[PDB]
């Protein structure tokens, strides 16, 4: 496999693409919601899927984010996603001010 | 500096400490950037939090306009629909 | 033949709150447009919900939630209040 | 009182809005105090917007109110322009706002 | 009878009912139930097959979620029609950005 | 029992029409009905909108016809109309 | 006479003023041409939506009213001139 | 003899031009252009003078907004002048196209 410099960097990427499993765990996420959902109302219940569905939404939501972030990052002469790279992306999409 | 019948119970499923950091990087590479800043990924969850509330806000509302205790997944869909992120696959 | 406007309803309330003040003819038109759009997003909202759980009625609560969702917080909650008081006002009378 | 609006204490047209809810196909049955509720609501909103519109007009040395006066009035308030964020303005015009860094040393 | 007289694969006496119960206009034009079944079938067919192609591209007997988006996401046209409608267990196209090369 | 009807019979023959001994998952099947029902409201709602703009009170085929044209891009749109126009045209021929 | 040499009408200065309105400070030579292309893209699609209704209406003299609904479709609602 | 230092004039106007409402595009050329394409679907059709303005406003504002997104991205890079890509970059991210 050639040498070692930036060897995995592109490798993991590819394997992750071929797959289609959830990027983030499905146990911490499950409480995260239960916990905030309480603050806006009491005595809450949850459909098995409802979360499954959120996970799907969210994950997908972030990737998408990163996907631009990357571009921005490239624009900059950089291969590094940065704390702001996040902001511009959002700002111009418009949720971020 | 005592044993003092000490009992230790702290909270790491729901709370953001508990969740897994690789769980994110897992996410980061699908996009395929080479590098992750420490600062950055903390912000990213930050936003996740912002996105997550608004939906549930609505979700909760539809659960409650019908006087229902069980929150429907459809309920989430419409929510997503309102922001223009509607999900095919679910709940026609 | 009968061009409608909501100019009449703006016209009173204007004076009720800023009586040494007036409206541009186009500024009023803009407002006419605004209300109707505003009338429709809500009405639209209302209708969808009726249908969702098969409700052959837009009651006084179906509108209420509708607004709650449609509107950003500070504005939404005051409006919720004015709403019930009015029902309060009108039914006994 | 005869006029409905007055029985509910308002300026907004009770019955004109009722008919508009039947000529818009929105549904098979029209509610009885819906109409009012709704009328009254907008009433507030109008006010809400029209309350500062005037204040803006005061701001700039005029006794009347031209449309920009509606525009600035809506953009500054976060709970105002937030909803209308999808509304663009007959000759809206612009908030003076110059980005941080291109301003000069 | 409907499919027959019309000559389509889609249900002509099903969308007529919903369009009158949705409550679109006052009455309903005779034009539509029939016409409305037709384009729908046409779209139905346009995806199945490219989905088929996509499954055969990577050599598979059965088509599954992953395939469908692969089909559409790659296609120029469908992709725009369903530009922001987002998708069940879907994952994504292989993409490698330029200056991220392993030289 | 329960209802929860769907377009499963229509999507299935279409796929048969385009690769007969080719298969599908039970997960892509709902995506499909979700997709159809979604396009359904998109088109029929717009028809409703025009009808009560230029001042009339029923929705015919012409309107869909118009609607479709601006709802979709150049090349698909024409073929789509064509198909649409004929199917019905034949329908009337019979009667 | 088919209207052409149109695209230019929107000369150097006017494209520029927009941008100042935008809050851009300065501008390279190249993009005067790029934007015209888009402007055209945008007009085409809207007018495309607008024209159909007008045809739908058995008329030629396409109304301001259509301009707008057509704008409401693409998703650029306008407050000001309509209904 | 005197000539203003670079960047002293441009800002001054920005604002002047920001305060006002009045349209920037020309009444005649605009009109001709609108006629040019409309003919290309169907030839020789008419519009109320206002109908033309209705159209004129919706796009004049539309650019000014995009130019604003173009500028942030110019800034993000440590740059100073809105370059081409930025516009395109912007176009791609908004994912209108």
Author numbering:
A (entry chain E): 39 to 135
B (entry chain F): 11 to 102
C (entry chain H): 29 to 121
D (entry chain G): 14 to 118
E (entry chain C): 16 to 118
F (entry chain D): 28 to 122
G (entry chain B): 20 to 102
H (entry chain A): 38 to 134
Sentences from the paper on this structure:
The extended family of ATPases related to the yeast Snf2 protein acts to alter DNA-protein interactions. At the heart of all these proteins are paired domains capable of rearranging during the ATP hydrolysis cycle to create a ratchet like motion along DNA in single base increments. The yeast Chd1 protein is a member of this protein family and acts to organise nucleosomes over coding regions. Chd1 enzyme engages nucleosomes in a conformation in which the SANT and SLIDE domains bind linker DNA, while the ATPase domains engage DNA at super helical location (SHL) 2.
As Chd1 binds to one side of the nucleosome, no steric clashes are anticipated should a second Chd1 bind linker DNA on the opposite side of the nucleosome. To investigate this further, complexes consisting of two Chd1 molecules bound to one nucleosome were prepared using nucleosomal DNA with symmetrical linkers of 14 base pairs and the images processed as indicated. Most particles were assigned to 2D classes in which two bound Chd1 molecules are discernible, though one is often more dominant likely as a result of the projections of the dominant orientations observed. All 3D classes have two bound Chd1 molecules and the best refined class provides an envelope with 11 Å resolution (FSC 0.143). There are no direct contacts between the two Chd1 proteins suggesting that the two bound enzymes are likely to function independently. Our envelope shows that both DNA-binding domains can bind to linker DNA simultaneously and that the extent of DNA unwrapping is similar on both sides of the nucleosome. This could relate to differences in the dynamic interactions of Chd1 with DNA on the two sides of the nucleosome. Even in the case of a nucleosome bound by two Chd1 molecules the lateral surfaces of the nucleosome are accessible for binding by other factors.
